[PDB]
Design an enzyme around this catalytic site. Structure first.
Site, PDB file in Angstrom:
ATOM      1  N   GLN A 101       0.815  -1.207   0.000  1.00 59.57           N
ATOM      2  CA  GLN A 101       0.000   0.000   0.000  1.00 59.57           C
ATOM      3  C   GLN A 101       0.850   1.259   0.000  1.00 59.57           C
ATOM      4  O   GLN A 101       1.925   1.271   0.554  1.00 59.57           O
ATOM      5  CB  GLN A 101      -0.904   0.023   1.232  1.00 59.57           C
ATOM      6  CG  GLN A 101      -2.316  -0.418   0.957  1.00 59.57           C
ATOM      7  CD  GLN A 101      -2.881   0.231  -0.290  1.00 59.57           C
ATOM      8  OE1 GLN A 101      -2.878   1.455  -0.420  1.00 59.57           O
ATOM      9  NE2 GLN A 101      -3.366  -0.592  -1.221  1.00 59.57           N
ATOM     10  N   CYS A 103      -5.279  -1.134   3.878  1.00 57.54           N
ATOM     11  CA  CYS A 103      -4.376  -2.232   4.185  1.00 57.54           C
ATOM     12  C   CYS A 103      -5.068  -3.565   4.216  1.00 57.54           C
ATOM     13  O   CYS A 103      -4.415  -4.604   4.281  1.00 57.54           O
ATOM     14  CB  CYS A 103      -3.688  -1.985   5.529  1.00 57.54           C
ATOM     15  SG  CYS A 103      -4.817  -1.299   6.787  1.00 57.54           S
ATOM     16  N   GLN A 162      -9.261 -28.545   9.416  1.00 57.41           N
ATOM     17  CA  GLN A 162      -8.967 -29.689   8.574  1.00 57.41           C
ATOM     18  C   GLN A 162     -10.035 -29.746   7.516  1.00 57.41           C
ATOM     19  O   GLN A 162      -9.747 -29.802   6.326  1.00 57.41           O
ATOM     20  CB  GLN A 162      -9.023 -30.991   9.367  1.00 57.41           C
ATOM     21  CG  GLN A 162      -8.045 -31.113  10.504  1.00 57.41           C
ATOM     22  CD  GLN A 162      -7.798 -32.555  10.853  1.00 57.41           C
ATOM     23  OE1 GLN A 162      -7.273 -32.866  11.913  1.00 57.41           O
ATOM     24  NE2 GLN A 162      -8.170 -33.452   9.947  1.00 57.41           N
ATOM     25  N   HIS A 211       0.706  -8.303  10.261  1.00 57.77           N
ATOM     26  CA  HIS A 211       0.820  -9.077   9.041  1.00 57.77           C
ATOM     27  C   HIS A 211      -0.238 -10.170   8.895  1.00 57.77           C
ATOM     28  O   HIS A 211      -0.495 -10.937   9.830  1.00 57.77           O
ATOM     29  CB  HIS A 211       2.209  -9.704   9.014  1.00 57.77           C
ATOM     30  CG  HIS A 211       2.670 -10.081   7.650  1.00 57.77           C
ATOM     31  ND1 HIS A 211       2.938  -9.144   6.678  1.00 57.77           N
ATOM     32  CD2 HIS A 211       2.895 -11.290   7.089  1.00 57.77           C
ATOM     33  CE1 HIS A 211       3.313  -9.761   5.574  1.00 57.77           C
ATOM     34  NE2 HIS A 211       3.295 -11.065   5.796  1.00 57.77           N
ATOM     35  N   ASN A 215       3.316 -17.778   4.372  1.00 58.30           N
ATOM     36  CA  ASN A 215       3.367 -16.364   4.119  1.00 58.30           C
ATOM     37  C   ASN A 215       3.319 -16.106   2.634  1.00 58.30           C
ATOM     38  O   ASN A 215       4.028 -16.737   1.850  1.00 58.30           O
ATOM     39  CB  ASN A 215       4.615 -15.720   4.670  1.00 58.30           C
ATOM     40  CG  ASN A 215       4.746 -14.302   4.200  1.00 58.30           C
ATOM     41  OD1 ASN A 215       4.169 -13.383   4.773  1.00 58.30           O
ATOM     42  ND2 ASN A 215       5.472 -14.118   3.117  1.00 58.30           N
ATOM     43  N   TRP A 220       4.161 -13.265   1.091  1.00 59.66           N
ATOM     44  CA  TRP A 220       5.328 -12.517   0.662  1.00 59.66           C
ATOM     45  C   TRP A 220       6.632 -13.325   0.575  1.00 59.66           C
ATOM     46  O   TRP A 220       7.670 -12.788   0.185  1.00 59.66           O
ATOM     47  CB  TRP A 220       5.493 -11.309   1.579  1.00 59.66           C
ATOM     48  CG  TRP A 220       4.472 -10.213   1.338  1.00 59.66           C
ATOM     49  CD1 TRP A 220       4.674  -9.043   0.653  1.00 59.66           C
ATOM     50  CD2 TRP A 220       3.104 -10.185   1.777  1.00 59.66           C
ATOM     51  NE1 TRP A 220       3.522  -8.294   0.645  1.00 59.66           N
ATOM     52  CE2 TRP A 220       2.544  -8.971   1.326  1.00 59.66           C
ATOM     53  CE3 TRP A 220       2.295 -11.067   2.509  1.00 59.66           C
ATOM     54  CZ2 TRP A 220       1.205  -8.618   1.584  1.00 59.66           C
ATOM     55  CZ3 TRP A 220       0.957 -10.709   2.764  1.00 59.66           C
ATOM     56  CH2 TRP A 220       0.435  -9.499   2.302  1.00 59.66           C
ATOM     57  N   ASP A 271     -69.379  -1.563 -13.815  1.00 62.94           N
ATOM     58  CA  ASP A 271     -69.905  -1.084 -15.082  1.00 62.94           C
ATOM     59  C   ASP A 271     -69.490  -1.954 -16.268  1.00 62.94           C
ATOM     60  O   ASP A 271     -68.486  -1.695 -16.927  1.00 62.94           O
ATOM     61  CB  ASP A 271     -69.440   0.351 -15.302  1.00 62.94           C
ATOM     62  CG  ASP A 271     -69.831   0.894 -16.663  1.00 62.94           C
ATOM     63  OD1 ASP A 271     -69.431   2.042 -16.967  1.00 62.94           O
ATOM     64  OD2 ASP A 271     -70.533   0.179 -17.420  1.00 62.94           O
ATOM     65  N   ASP A 320     -61.737   1.416  18.313  1.00 55.81           N
ATOM     66  CA  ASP A 320     -61.773   2.748  18.899  1.00 55.81           C
ATOM     67  C   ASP A 320     -62.669   3.603  18.006  1.00 55.81           C
ATOM     68  O   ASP A 320     -63.564   3.105  17.325  1.00 55.81           O
ATOM     69  CB  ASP A 320     -60.365   3.365  18.912  1.00 55.81           C
ATOM     70  CG  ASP A 320     -59.537   2.954  20.121  1.00 55.81           C
ATOM     71  OD1 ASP A 320     -59.448   1.746  20.420  1.00 55.81           O
ATOM     72  OD2 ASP A 320     -58.955   3.854  20.764  1.00 55.81           O
TER      73      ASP A 320
END
Lengths: 176, 640
Positions: B98, B104, B228, B245, B269, B271, B525, B557
């Site tokens: 970035q 990120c 798993q 990371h 990883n 990278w 009608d 009511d």
């Protein structure tokens, strides 16, 4: 790049729904009844809470009973395209229109004008003697125009014939 | 707009539209088109939809005027590199990063894609380049609330001192990244809106799968016998920590030293480089890692392989219109049974288990990811001994539950993990409180085949069809007829209006608007006159009589105002049954801003409904289920 009257209106929206930018039929009604219930060379008491309600349902694709500000514009505009025709054909200032001039304003709004359809219009928006006030005149075209489009939409190819199942029907017909 | 639209998209979505194959075209933009219409012009695309102005960057924050975005260089790859590639092969590492302004969560979200090249085939339409047919425009497919949208964007990226401020590669050359990110910012309406967003979210957007997540801090018993299964399924797993990371859980087998049974976690990883103090992991990882997210996937993702257990799936749509379908929460039993209802029937079981999520569609309101979300949630109920019946107040006032989602969150999408005895279970998506205007999608990842339907009614109208022939008058009424009109002794809309109004003095209320009358008439009608005689006027009078009994039997009511939620009941009394959609149109087209339906509209509806029905019924004399019409003929019915 929108006109000044839209800007002031635009402002009137955020002050109501805020970011939601929406109006309800009622809201739309006054928002409309204060801009047209102005200049005297045009008579009317104002749009009735039903007229707006169709304006709103006809522009509503999410069935929420609300008018988006962009969809509003579209309508408003059309309203103005017609706040003419009528104002031009009602000279009596009585706030209506000549029974035999009615067929004159609807051609000045560019339509196919068929016999059968006509009546329908006449029986739905005119007064006992056969006269239509500003309200119902404009209220008619929105709705009319809407169906001309609803049909254009349901007919993608062009078989000048749409076709609906009952739910599709009751919907089109009921939300107007 | 108008129902017509939301309705023509249905026949289209029912065909293909939305699915990968036929994904929607955001803002109605054609790649092929524009592309083609850009090479022949000798120009480079220029997104009129998402211009390379400041507003694309943001509003308040990365907003114009602001320095964060002041002085900016929208340069295309070419203008800053040399032989820029779109995407080349599939490295073993990423190289992604970035810039200043960038967020990120993209780093993790994108990364994963990188290291599973077919998942990336869904998002990035590997079929672009800066040399063969380059016009300065690329496209990508993104999954949204249940259906794939396709975004077209130009390659003007925001730099500043030849430096890319958002998502880019350390080693230049590749740009699919920075673009797929420019794209996503567009669909979300701006870069600054990505400012936040959950790795868990944008990722579903990139794949279409369902993201379940756990707090390693305090994890579940079966925490293990899942990962798993997770990897086992094909899903992808990541993991972050309070360091900053994002990793990946590439697998984990409970290797047994036959004396210890030391299970391990194969973290990885993106990278490349990896280094530490421990082992894979001593599963002492739970004490080392802070967050874990497994993203089970929509099965058509891996269009091949036959590797990894493939989930089962079924998704549906629903809405909550205030004052009508918006109950939400067991807590409000005065509306809850009014929510949408869906049937899920589990056949065989495991060797059932199912994933259920309730994600909530966009809403004008919301401008940044994460923000402005509703508090959705959802309950599921046990089916005693049964579809065409929308569960009533009773059914829930009764059965208490049978496992209800673990809370109502204030966030996009909500999933829970269930395992159940192959019976039919009902679930009621909904919001927290009631009256919350908004839409949603309910997906369901199971283990074995599942039949997801909906508990609701069908258009069903059957009124009393009297055949009195100018008789069956009781005369007391007959007598009391003609004397109301006059000469011709018939009635008219307006005549009917005064006549009718002049018929009241029992209990707001004030007879009916003409429009009503206007249609009272219209529903009777036949001769095409414009007036009514004894027979019809009779039916009317009596129909009214009925109608009125109900408004009153409920407006307990002297308000002359009834809560919209009543209307569903009501319609049932008047012999009308309809699915969720209509009632909405019924309350949308007929309630008040306070959500009250006066008596007039109440009947304006009942009447109108009956008319439109009959017209439909009449016109489909065979019961095929469709009533074909040309324009003209349509326009006639159309006007009311």
């Amino acid at each position: 790049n929108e006109s000044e009257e839209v800007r002031q209106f635009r402002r009137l929206f955020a002050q109501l729904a805020g970011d939601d930018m929406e109006v309800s039929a009622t809201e739309l009604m006054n928002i409309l009844n204060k801009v047209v219930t102005r200049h005297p060379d045009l008579k009317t008491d104002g749009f009735g809470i039903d007229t707006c309600r169709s304006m709103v349902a006809v522009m509503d694709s999410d069935t929420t009973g609300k008018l988006g500000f962009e969809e509003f514009k579209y309508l408003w505009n059309n309203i103005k395209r017609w706040q003419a025709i009528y104002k031009q054909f009602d000279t009596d200032r009585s706030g209506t229109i000549c029974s035999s001039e009615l067929p004159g304003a609807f051609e000045a709004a560019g339509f196919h004008l068929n016999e059968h359809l006509y009546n329908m219009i006449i029986r739905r928006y005119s007064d006992e003697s056969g006269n239509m006030d500003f309200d119902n005149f404009i209220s008619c075209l929105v709705r009319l125009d809407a169906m001309f489009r609803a049909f254009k939409s349901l007919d993608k190819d062009g078989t000048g014939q749409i076709q609906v199942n009952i739910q599709e029907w009751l919907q089109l017909t009921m939300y107007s | 707009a108008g129902i017509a639209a939301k309705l023509a998209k249905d026949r289209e979505a029912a065909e293909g539209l939305g699915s990968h194959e036929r994904a929607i075209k955001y803002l109605n933009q054609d790649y092929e088109a524009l592309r083609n219409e850009c090479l022949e012009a000798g120009t480079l695309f220029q997104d009129p939809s998402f211009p390379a102005i400041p507003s694309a960057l943001g509003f308040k924050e990365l907003g114009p005027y602001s320095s964060k975005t002041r002085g900016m260089r929208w340069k295309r790859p070419t203008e800053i590199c040399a032989d820029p590639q779109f995407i080349i092969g599939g490295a073993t590492r990423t190289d992604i990063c970035q810039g200043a302004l960038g967020d990120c969560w993209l780093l993790a979200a994108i990364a994963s894609l990188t290291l599973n090249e077919e998942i990336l085939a869904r998002v990035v339409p590997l079929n672009q380049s800066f040399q063969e047919n380059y016009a300065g425009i690329f496209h990508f497919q993104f999954w949204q609330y249940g259906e794939w949208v396709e975004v077209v964007v130009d390659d003007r990226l925001p730099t500043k001192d030849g430096e890319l401020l958002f998502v880019h590669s350390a080693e230049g050359s590749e740009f699919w990244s920075a673009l797929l990110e420019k794209a996503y910012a567009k669909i979300n309406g701006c870069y600054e809106a990505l400012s936040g967003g959950a790795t868990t979210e944008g990722f579903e957007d990139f794949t279409g799968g369902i993201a379940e997540w756990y707090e390693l801090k305090k994890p579940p018993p079966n925490l293990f016998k899942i990962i798993q299964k997770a990897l086992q399924k094909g899903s992808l797993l990541g993991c972050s920590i309070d360091k900053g990371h994002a990793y990946s859980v590439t697998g984990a087998e409970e290797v047994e030293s036959n004396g210890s049974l030391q299970k391990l976690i194969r973290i990885r990883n993106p990278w490349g480089e990896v280094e530490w103090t421990g082992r894979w992991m001593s599963f002492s990882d739970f004490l080392r890692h802070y967050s874990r997210l497994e993203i089970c996937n929509l099965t058509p993702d891996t269009l091949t392989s036959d590797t990894y257990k493939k989930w089962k799936l079924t998704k549906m749509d629903g809405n909550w219109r205030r004052g009508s379908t918006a109950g939400g929460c067991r807590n409000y039993p005065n509306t809850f049974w009014m929510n949408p209802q869906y049937l899920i029937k589990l056949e065989e079981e495991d060797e059932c288990t199912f994933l259920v999520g309730l994600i909530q569609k966009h809403r004008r309101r919301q401008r940044k990811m994460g923000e402005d979300m509703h508090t959705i949630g959802f309950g599921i109920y046990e089916v005693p001994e049964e579809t065409n019946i929308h569960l009533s107040k009773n059914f829930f006032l009764t059965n208490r539950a049978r496992e209800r989602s673990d809370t109502f969150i204030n966030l996009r999408e909500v999933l829970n993990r269930f395992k159940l005895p192959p019976g039919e279970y009902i679930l009621v998506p909904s919001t927290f409180e009631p009256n919350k205007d908004g839409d949603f999608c309910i997906r369901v990842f199971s283990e074995k085949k599942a039949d997801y339907q909906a508990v609701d009614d069908e258009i069903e109208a059957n009124l009393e069809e009297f055949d009195i022939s100018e008789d069956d008058i009781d005369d007391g009424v007959r007598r009391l007829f003609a004397q109301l009109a006059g000469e011709d002794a018939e009635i008219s809309a307006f005549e009917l209006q005064t006549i009718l109004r002049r018929v009241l003095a029992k209990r707001k209320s004030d007879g009916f608007s003409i429009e009503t009358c206007k249609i009272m008439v219209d529903m009777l009608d036949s001769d095409g006159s414009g007036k009514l005689g004894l027979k019809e006027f009779y039916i009317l009078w009596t129909k009214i009589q009925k109608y009125q009994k109900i408004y009153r039997e409920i407006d307990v009511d002297r308000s002359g105002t009834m809560n919209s939620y009543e209307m569903r009941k009501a319609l049932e009394e008047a012999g009308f049954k309809m699915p969720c959609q209509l009632h909405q149109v019924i309350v949308a087209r007929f309630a008040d801003d306070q959500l009250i339906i006066d008596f007039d509209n109440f009947v304006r509806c009942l009447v109108r409904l009956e008319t439109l029905f009959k017209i439909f019924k009449q016109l489909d004399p065979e019961n095929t289920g469709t009533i074909e019409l040309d324009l003209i003929s349509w326009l006639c019915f159309s006007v009311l």
